[PDB]
Each structure stands twice: as structure tokens, then as C-alpha cells.
DNA sequence: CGTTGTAT
DNA sequence: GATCATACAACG
DNA sequence: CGTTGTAT
DNA sequence: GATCATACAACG
């Protein structure tokens, strides 16, 4: 179908390239030899055909096209109808590229063992840098010129293609190693595996390739950092918005601009997934504390408008992550192009990891953190600072539990919640809020991530199957005033609507379960499941560090300014002689230093003084500023040397921030 | 199908909204009443069912879904199965929105006349501006209405917020509800076709939506150059289609004679200039520049924008591209995504972007009003003839072939030297169109002369082939010829037994030789010339090209112009822009000289100056009085640094003063002489011709 | 019908 | 990320 | 089986 | 500009 076949059938000379990107496929087809080189693009990530039947594999259109292209059936085929001498897999140097490579290797090993054993499976190794090396630095196959692609991966005289082989006595390890990687079950074995950690062995390639993707997804994709509770994509988005000046007080700008900036500066991925994550951050029903200010259609409790239409802006809450940024609080690593710099963390003032929470899926592990109440978590942190010996139960007496932005009751025993937080893993269930008035049941609040229309459809279908003769009629009185209003009117006032309600809790989606897995990337740099006490403590460490760094930065600034000011006052005290030196001495810079006992910095400061600064008001301003800066310097130096004053400062900032960004408990606890 | 129906069947109360955007449809569905309001989105421009059969209309999925939604067949139906009391068309305030409106009006008028006559067709008028000062909030569909609102708000506590809606997708659901949905606050007009007006309605709508005619639309556009509860459909349709027509003509399809660019292209190259993506700069991701174009200047889609950009980057599409990309930008077709490709302006683009910040072009504010945008670009060479353009508007179109830079430059210089130069004399310089595809342009020089004399015509190209040895080898194809399509054509022609003379067809097109098509004959006695003529007549080895020199002149109105008119008018543009540059630089030099004189005066009496500074409260007016010095010079003295009190600084200032005096003399001299001005223009033209010069790619033959 | 190029 | 139907002029 | 959220 | 199949962990 989408194949671009060659003008030859002679094996041991013909080559079939499987390209990752359709665009990359176009570039490859533009540079092939055509006399023996055919190019077939595989649109997107293929299926995991390691636990699929030999007949079920033909169902997937990608694997189907691959099968038809190779001219072999997923069973013993043994050449014969092999249309190409060599089948080479060509994907870019991404971790995702190695993932696709490992997938194709799984498909080939499991369903075409004869082909791999005969030595027809090849891996194309593209260069990572060009000055070629396996400086320009190619981000992908789509980004590199056709001729470059030809020289790098196509032309045999200049190519670097390795042959993947599964020799005897290594075939046992191959089938064994590849199993734990691509098996839908196991999973824990993959956790432990990640924990412990011209021709090439297929088992060696698969093990090293899958490690790259696993580590990349775990560290730089699915799992959030304990500091600001953000994933790389989200951090890049909010920072690129900060750079775009899109503050909460600023005017709205088109989403396409900020997205294009995120891609063009920091995020080397697609615009679709980026704008998707952004839209997710902008939704009040998706995010407890969004960041998170949009104009236009940003969805509803679903799908939204295009980025070419919507306009965006950071929330006032986002300040908690973006204030104190340019004050030497976070470290900076350079971006993919090396043209700009990017913050590794954000100077969070409140533990966003607990506030907003996160849900993600990596390789071998996942993360599921529920949102919480800002005031409660803040109070818990402050309590943790005041009394460091505070146990988990006392913290639980402050933080009731998860706080979802969907109202409704969280029906879960306080002991069960206590266990969930003490062990870091568990499940929390929510139930819709309903009231009888009058005699009829009206739902006024739905659980988190409940469609509402789907619930109505569920009850309606259940009625249609004659399973609910107790209910006379179902009406949706959900208007602008009342967002969620689902009325259920029963036939006769003798029917137990409570029993029907419990039945709806058991059958419909009025009651929902939520996975809880407090897994995150700690300050150590490695992912780990942590309990509430550990999270609050470690975050307290992070905050303490960042605050300390801010204080030191400000201290240095103040000191330098004080030095320059002292120099300036010295200048003013003897301005006539200074100006005289300027207009009578050859190179007055070192002359000023000698005559007044002044540093080169202070000398340059004097030299940079303006004539309008010779007025008296300027000397007054400078002296006053000197006094103020002296007091501030004393304060900063004082707080820096006392652990008590430092902790007190942290407490002050926590309480102050808790008041400004505070919110009442939305989802109450019940049973 | 995509309908979000309401929970009622009671007519004279139920309303059906036809939304332009699926996203806007989402916003509308999110804000409807559901008790009587149903929402159906129409994704994209509908079909023009004004010359289509009553059955052919049902073939188009959009019109089909609309028909099923209304519960009426495109023939006489007469209510009965009418599912909704009112059918309202909802589109954003674009000219494109009014186009969609006119299209839906065509569909309803021709195929559902009974429905429109009964009064069920409604047009929803959305607000263009939103003004809010405090708890007060106002909406306005007219700019005059907006300025009216602002005048009233001038009595209240200041600082009002104007929003300006670019479309329905960008406005919040509740705003859409209050503005166009909620009956108590909406502004929906009823479209009616009363008796004796139905004849005029059918007449006016015909010339607008008829595939033929066209010239009538030209003449109509030529001659053509508050609200109530109900409006005449013919009055609405004629004015709506006028808006779209004028918008497409002026701000879409037709290029401006100055820089030879369309609004999209101009916005792209300017946004690249602002992004600092110069020819000497490093490549940046295309998504960045596209996102900038959309986020700053262009209020349209990213796809079509990146499409135009990619088209500008192609060496085979653009004679002089601008136009520097890395990655897959297509081949002689389609390309890679913007998330992968990297971009940068060409060295040629300098000709449009140099002299930008020198007061050469006018500036209009952007859609948000936050930034400014150039109306034109200070072109140094007539890009309108160099690159050429192809576009389709309403009533008219434009087809301009590319030309050779050296030839056109030489023609311009010749036009400056001898202003009485005729068209033939210019034609002796400019041979004709110059395509970036090699190959011969087999067209009589007289025919070309006529084509250029009338501004309209057609130029034909033919592939370049040679016999070696005994076999025919094609080495160059005409512009926009696929080659693979040519191969497929000849091969199919062979398969149909139409070519028994030809033994074999081979594609020896490699990296070294881009186009190499070998045709081997059976036996050496067959006349391959006859076969070649047959392939020229049948296959795509010979291609015709439309020529329609229509463009927007300096007058501001589109018109077909001949080569002499184009070159002359462009010479006017260039002369004017150069004059503006010279004047700008002159003003700068003069001001700097003034400031320098002030500074020297200050240096001459520095002690007294410092005295005034340290003895007079606010010395600015004191310095002015004591030395006879302007406020600007006073501020200049006040901003002097102590390190500038040295002698070397005064020396530098004096030397710069001398230089600036000489430069001022030169600038003022060139400004007052027509001969010196013309000499400057000639010098710059010749200089540009050398640096950006190109050899003739497509030779002329017969 | 089949193109061409900015638009939805 | 590639693809699908549409408007509009006007020639082969 | 069907979700959830960054990825091809 | 909306849509379609995929990986990955893991619960109901
Ligand atoms: C604005 C959207 C509107 O919808 C579109 C299409 N439709 C889908 C099938 N429908 C039956 C008819 C409408 C379409 F076929 C192509 C495009 C398209 O190429 C495009 C672009 O920006 O390049 C943008 N759009 C398109
Ligand atoms: C990798 C690209 C190309 O393939 C994609 C899809 N396929 C099309 C149908 N095929 C049968 C299977 C693959 C797809 F259904 C969705 C997406 C998608 O949502 C997306 C994104 O960036 O958000 C990007 N891609 C997608
Ligand atoms: Mg990639
Ligand atoms: Mg997607
Ligand atoms: Mg619009
Ligand atoms: Mg398109």
C-alpha cells in the first residue's frame, strides 16, 4: 500500500527500510537508490505483538502491512516469498525510536524467528552529532536533510547498519530477556530490572534499547518531581509562558504562540500533546488548582477548541511556582539546541505535588496522586516545622485527605485513608451527593471525572432493560444556575428510593473508585513511593534550600550595591578633586583608586556617574538607600546564621501564602 | 449525526443553530437551553448548491446532514416534518463567516424556498467588540457602536477594556449564550423574502453564486466602489458576499505591486525578521515562527500559513525563494511537519527587509492592537516580476510568471536612463518569463510581446531532449511537471498499444542527474521526432501556463497592468521609499548634530555647568537660559557621564561632528537633485543586480 | 474534469 | 501527524 | 475491557 | 481542524 518498492527482485542486494515517521519516510524515499532500496513508513508506535496470537497479529493494519511487505506469514514461512534480501529498521535516536525498534524486534523475534535467525533483520544506526558522530546534533530523522539521511543511513558505502542476530546458546537468553520486557504481566520484574541497572546480539540490543526508553519515560515524562510537583512538559509550558510575559495580570495571548514557543525553545516533541497537557492544566474540573487561565472553548465535564482559536494566560496560583525564579533559587541546564537555558526545577512556595497531584504511566511503574486542600497541607507543613517529631496520625488530623474539585462526598473510613497515606498505596472512593425533594431524588453533585451524561445514559439503559421499574421518570434539570442536577422521579411514594439509590451506587457511575500511588521523583534524583510524612518532610527540605538560596542571592546583591554606594559617597565628599582627576590625569581609573582608596568597581561606578547626579537630592537618595540596604543586609545576615530564624521565616511565608491562595474544602468526608 | 438535539418537538418555540466551527459548535452546545435549542455544527465551507441538482445537493454530506436535520427534502416539502420552529445560521464575524452565511442562504433560497418564505431562516449577528468597565459590560456589532459606548463610559471611573472578537472559537460559552443564544439578550435577525422582492432576490443571488458569469461580478465590484428584527434576504446576501469578495481581493489572493507579496507572506517574512532569523543566523523550528505569525499578525489557521511558507521555501516553486529550510521541504509535492522542519530567511529576502527601520513603509496596528505591522516592505528589486504570483479571488484572479533578476534590473535602469522607453525596447532586455525548471519556452517573441502588451495571455513550455545514441533522453521538464506522472503517462500510452515504435522506457534519474528520462526505440529506422511530437501533444512534456498580470497598484485598487506600467509604477514606489529613507537618515543626522553642538558648548564651560547643577533646583531650565540651549541639549548635558569629561571623549565627539556635517551635506545635496537621485537609484539597482544575480534558467526557443 | 493557492 | 470536502477564476 | 495522561 | 491506533501500569 504505502510501500515504495524498488525496481529489482534479486535478493542479497535488495534492502527494505522501515521508517518511523511518515515525514521521515518521505525524506528516506527522497534519498533511496530505488535500484535495490525500498522504503516503507510505519505511522506511529506499532503493537506489542509479544503476547498476541499468530492470527491476531494480522489484524493490526501496521503489522499487516509489514507482513505483506516482508512476504512472509507469522509461522515458519522460511524465505521463499521473501521480497527483500535485507530488512533494516530505521528510526531516529529518540528513546521512543528505541522503543519502536524494540517493538519491531519483539514482533520479528516472536512471529518471524526464522527470518531473524537467517540474518535478515538489520538495525540502522543514525548519527547523534554532526560537526558525523554516533556541532549540529540531529533531533530526528524528520529534521535532517535528505542527502544527510542518505549518507547517514542509506548509501551502503557510507552507512552504519548493524546486523541483529540470535545465535545458538544465546537464543535461550534472547527469549528469556525479551520476555520480561514485553510481557503485559510481570511489571514488578521490570521495576527490579530497572533498579539493578558490523553485527550485534539481538538480546544485547533489546536490553539496552528498552533501558533507554524506560529510563527516559520514568525520569523525563511520566513521573513528577517532588519539588514543584510538575512533569517536564508542564514545567516547560509554565516557564515558556513566564518568558512570554503571560502573567495573571497580563493580557491574553493566542495559545498557538505559547505552544510554538514551548516547541521552539524547550520541548523537542509534538505540538498536539503539548497543547493537550496545557488544556488539561487549564481545566478547573481537571485541575484542583489550575494554572490555568483560558479564553474560549477549553472543554467541559472532554474535548475543546483548537489552539488557533483559544487564548491563554498563567493563573495567579502559578505565581507560587514562578516567583523567586530569577533569584538564584533553581539550577539551569541548557536546552536541546544549546541556544538558551532552562530551569531544572521551579522555586515552589507550596507543595504543588500534593496540591494538584499527578497521574502518569511509565515503563515498569506509574504514579497516582490525588489533589489536596491548600490550607490543610500548609497547616500540616507548618505543624511539621513547629514540632518536627510530629507523627503521621497528627498530620492526618490536619489533612483530612484528598480534596477533589467536584464537590460530592468522599465515602472512605478515616482508618482506611490513614492506611492509604501510611503505606503510600491504596484506593479512595467517592459518591454523588443527592437529596430527596420532594419524594423524588435529585443529584446535585457528581464524583470526580464523572461524565454525568454517561451516568444518565447508564440509568436510562438500565431502565430500558426493565431492571428499574421503581423509577417512573428520569429528567435532567441541569441548567446554567445548577451545573449538575439529575432528577429521578419514582412511581408512587411507597417505593424505597434509598434502595434504588444504593443500587445506582453499585451499578452506575454515581460511585467511583480512584487509584492512589504516591510515586514521585525525590530530591535524590530517583523515583520512589513515599508516605505523607516523607513527602512533607522532603518538600520542607527543598523549600528550606530554595529559600536559603534566595536569601544568599539577595545578600550578595545588597553587599555589592553597598560597596558601590560607599564608593559613590566617597566621590561626592570630594567631587571637585574627582572631576579634576578626570580632566587632568591620563587614565583616571587607577588614579581615582590611589587618591581615595577605592576599588576598581567603585572607580568605574564613579566614572559612570551622570552630571545630573551631582545634585543634592541624589546624595540624599543615595544615603537613605545606603541606610535601608544596611538594615536589610543586617536582617538577611541574621536570618542566614540562625536555624530558628530560618524556620520561622519558612513558617511566616507558608502562613502568608496559605491565606492569599487559600480555598475551602470542596469534597467533604462521609461514610 | 453530529447533532446535539433538544428535548422538545413543540414548534414556534424550538430553535436550530447552524454553527460554523466545530469548536464554536462546542461552545454553542455548551451554552444552549436544551429545552428548545438544538445545535448542529457545519465543519468548513459548505457546497455552493445554486447550480446543483436537487438530488446532487443530498450527495454532499454537509447539505445532507442539514436536510435530515431540518426534516425537509429539497423539494416543496412544506413544513409537516419540520423538526424546528426557527433555523438560525451562526458564524463568526469573519468575511469568511459572511461567505458561509451567503452559501447557506443559497442552499436555503434555491432548495428550500418555502421554508425561507414561511420565515424560518434566521441570521445570528455576533458582537465584534466587548467593552467592560467595572461591573458594566457592553457588546457592540459595529465599530461606531463601540466608539459610542466608549464615549458614554468617559463619564464613569476610567480604564475600560476593549476585547475585539476575532471569532466564535475564542469567546467564552456564556458570552456566546448572552450574545447569540439567550432570547432575552440575543441579536438575531429574521431573513425574509417578501412578494415582489422574490424576483429581485433570485436575480441578485444568481450573479453572486453562478459558476459562470464572473465578469458580471467584476463589474458589480466595480460599481460598488443599525439593525432591526427583520431584514431582506437579498439585502443581506448582496452585502455579505460583497464583504467577502472585497476581503479576498484586497487581503488574500492579490499581491501588492510594491513588494509583490500577499498579506500572509509579508507577515511571515516580517515575523521572521522580528525573530532575528536572518540568512546568517542559525535555523529555528518552524513551529516557533508559525506560532509567532499567528500570535502576532495573522488571525487565521496554522496549516495554510505553514503551507504558504513551505511553498516560499521551495526552489522549484519559487524562482527566488525566501526561503531557507532544513529537513524535508518536499520535492518535485508534500513535505514534513512544522514540528520537525527548521527555517530561516534567504539572502534574497534582504531585498525586502533591509531599509525596514528607516521610515520607508507605513504601519498599521495588528488585530489585538498590542503590536504594529508594516503595510508594505521596502523592496529594493521588483519582486512582483521576479517571483511572480498566482491567486484566485472573487470575480478576478492573478497569474504572474517569474522573471530573471538581472534582466528586470537592467530594464528598470534602462527605464530610469530613458523614461520615454517603449514596451518593445524593454522587451529587447527582458526576454520573457524565467521559470526555475530549465527547459525551453517555445513561444514566438511576437506572441510574448502581445502577452506583455495586453497584460494577459499564455506561455507554453516544452521539455529539453537530446538523441544519444539513437535513444531519446529528456534532461529537463517544464515547470510543475511531476516527471513520475510523465513516466506514468508515456507508460500507460505504451500499455494501450499506442506506442509500438518505442521499445523501452527507462528512468535513469539519479542524484547526479535529477531528470533523466530515456526513450529507446525498436530499430533505428523509426522517426523518433514524430513520436516526440506525439508525446508533446499527449503527455505532459509540453505544458501551458496562464498569464494574467493583475495586481494591487499604488492606488490601492486591483488592476491588470502591462510590463511598462508595472516597471514604471514600481519605479515610483522605489523612488518614493528611497526618498523616505534619505529623509529619515537626514533627520537623525540633524538631531545628532544638534545634540553634539550642545555637548561641545557644555564642555567649553563645564565648571559653570556643574555649578548650575549643584546650585540650581532643577537645572534643566537654568542651563537653557544661561547658554541659550534647547531642552533636548539640556537633557543631553544632564545625561553626560563623568568619564566623558575627558579630552579623548571631546575629540571623538568633534570628529563625529565633522563626519555628521559632511554626511548631512551629502544627504541634503542628493535630496534636492533629480539627477543625483536617479544616479543613486541606478547605482543601487546595478549593485543589487550583481549580488543577487542569476543566469537564465529557461532559454527561449521555438 | 483537473489544475493552481490562501481560506474554513 | 496525514487525510478528507469545500470556495473562487479560468485555461487546457 | 475501559479507563487515565505524555508520547509516536 | 477533528479523527484514528498504538505503548505503558494497574484497578474495577
Ligand atoms: C479548517 C479545516 C476544516 O475541515 C477540513 C476538511 N474537512 C473534513 C471533511 N469534511 C467533509 C469537509 C471539511 C478538509 F477536508 C481539509 C481541511 C484542510 O486541509 C485544512 C487546512 O487547514 O489545511 C483545514 N480544514 C480542513
Ligand atoms: C504519531 C501520529 C500519527 O499517527 C497517529 C494516529 N494514527 C492514525 C491511524 N493509524 C491507524 C494509527 C496511527 C492516531 F490515531 C492518533 C495520533 C495522535 O493523536 C497524535 C498526536 O500527536 O496527538 C499523533 N499521531 C497519531
Ligand atoms: Mg523523533
Ligand atoms: Mg493526539
Ligand atoms: Mg473564523
Ligand atoms: Mg489543508
Residue numbers in the entry:
A (entry chain G): 400 to 530, 538 to 540, 561 to 623, 1006 to 1109, 1113 to 1482
B (entry chain A): 400 to 624, 1003 to 1109, 1113 to 1482
Q: Which statements did the authors publish about this structure?
A:
In bacteria, topoisomerase IV, a tetramer of two ParC and two ParE subunits, unlinks daughter chromosomes prior to cell division, whereas the related enzyme gyrase, a GyrA2GyrB2 tetramer, supercoils DNA and helps unwind DNA at replication forks. Levofloxacin is a broad-spectrum third-generation fluoro­quinolone antibiotic.
We have co-crystallized the K. pneumoniae topoisomerase IV ParC/ParE breakage-reunion domain (ParC55; residues 1–490) and ParE TOPRIM domain (ParE30; residues 390–631) with a precut 34 bp DNA duplex (the E-site), stabilized by levofloxacin. The X-ray crystal structure of the complex was determined to 3.35 Å resolution, revealing a closed ParC55 dimer flanked by two ParE30 monomers. Residues 6–30 of the N-terminal α-helix α1 of the ParC subunit again embrace the ParE subunit, ‘hugging’ the ParE subunits close to either side of the ParC dimer. The methylpiperazine at C7 (using the conventional quinolone numbering; C9 in the IUPAC numbering) on the drug extends towards residues Glu474 and Glu475 for S. pneumoniae and towards Gln460 and Glu461 for K. pneumoniae, where the glutamate at 474 is substituted by a glutamine at 460 in the Klebsiella strain. They both exist within the same crystal in the two different dimers in the asymmetric unit. For K. pneumoniae both of the carboxyl O atoms are pointing towards the Mg2+ ion at distances of 4.86 and 4.23 Å. The CC25 (the drug concentration that converted 25% of the supercoiled DNA substrate to a linear form) was 0.5 µM for the Klebsiella enzyme and 1 µM for the pneumococcal enzyme.
